[PDB]
Symmetry: D2
Subunit: 115 residues, 4 copies
């Protein structure tokens, strides 16, 4: 698993479950080509998005549908979605975890890049 | 001032100065149209992007060029940019402050909305 | 103003108003002595805690009473308070802004230090 | 494992390894009694701090020695340590993860409370 996403809820202190997201890869014409997608598990994690052969160097965007998550909880959010845009590079063996911590008017994201 | 952006640097404990950003607004045909742009001052703030008359209801995206900021400090960061996407003025005019805290592998963003 | 504190609410997208806090300074005998206290204004800011003459080198602790803030909004939060402990003025006088972003199960704090 | 701590480094995009921390429980005389301690693993995690029988309701403090971590990396930090103070409550079966994300002048902490 070269790319994993984990989402947590800062209002409830819990994994953010059933959060939909799409991953895009940037095309040579500067458009966003759909690449992978899924919904987070009961642990707030989404695995199996891609494979090592497919996950080549380039620019990727992860669009997390935070608005639908808050609306299902009855909470009015600020953001339409949370977007994480990054370059994947080949500097030795690398696995990427994108983590996002969600509040109604705020989010934080970090990347854990390990061997 | 209906739309202000503030950016801080979590490595140096200082405002993030000279950070470029571009604001876009979603058009009727669902494309992103250029709306405003500028760069942060010595206080880390960008004022004067728009006016109350021009800042109509819509979906706006603030694209903060964090990669260029970190590169000039000698750091190769994870993200290409920080994106903040939100619906503005859906219940009438509001004033928005978009704040971003930057680290090389992480950022946080929040919004302060006042009537 | 050599020491200012700003507090924001990530659930409401607003300044966190009427948040009490206490500042302590570590004495020679290694105990925490009361130094200053106050509560945030309608802008979420607390100014005037100390003066340049009184704010000598030392280890300071800012204890932000986040639990009382959330309780008044009907929320049972995780943390008892947010603590920020730092050495101040070790290289000569500085001005410090301590900022905190609050959610029920999470907070973030940063510091802006200027000469 | 009723209480786990995870620490990440926002400058390097990696687990924060070998971070020392102490856990205290508040005494009836309002002093902090040492309870448990350890250092984070190569995954940035510290497990085995306590057992279910020992981890009774009360107020706990986790003091994370972030200053020594940054000094070992050659980076000048703001905080003396990161302190997380919380009430443990018996509302059904509950396991607590305290997570902290570290930058030199900023940190964020959240709690993941699961069944
Ligand atoms: C870019 C500013 C900023 O972005 C953040 C994102 C997440 C958490 C936090 I805390 C912050 C934060 C602040 O610390 C801050 C906000 C304002 I409004 C200020 O006026 C000042 I001084 C400081
Ligand atoms: C120390 C970990 C951590 O602390 C934070 C504080 C604020 C915001 C964030 I996003 C984080 C964060 C994570 O990124 C994270 C959390 C867990 I729980 C994980 O399992 C993994 I993988 C990654």
């Amino acid at each position: 698993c070269p790319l994993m996403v984990k989402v947590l809820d800062a209002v409830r202190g819990s994994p953010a479950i059933n959060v939909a997201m799409h991953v895009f890869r940037k095309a040579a014409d500067d458009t966003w080509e759909p690449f992978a997608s899924g919904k987070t598990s009961e642990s707030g994690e989404l695995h199996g998005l891609t494979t090592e052969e497919e996950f080549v160097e380039g620019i990727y965007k992860v669009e997390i549908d935070t608005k639908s998550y808050w609306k299902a909880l009855g909470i009015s959010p600020f953001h339409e979605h949370a977007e994480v845009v990054f370059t994947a590079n080949d500097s030795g063996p690398r696995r990427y975890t994108i983590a996002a911590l969600l509040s109604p008017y705020s989010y934080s994201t970090t990347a854990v890049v390990t061997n």
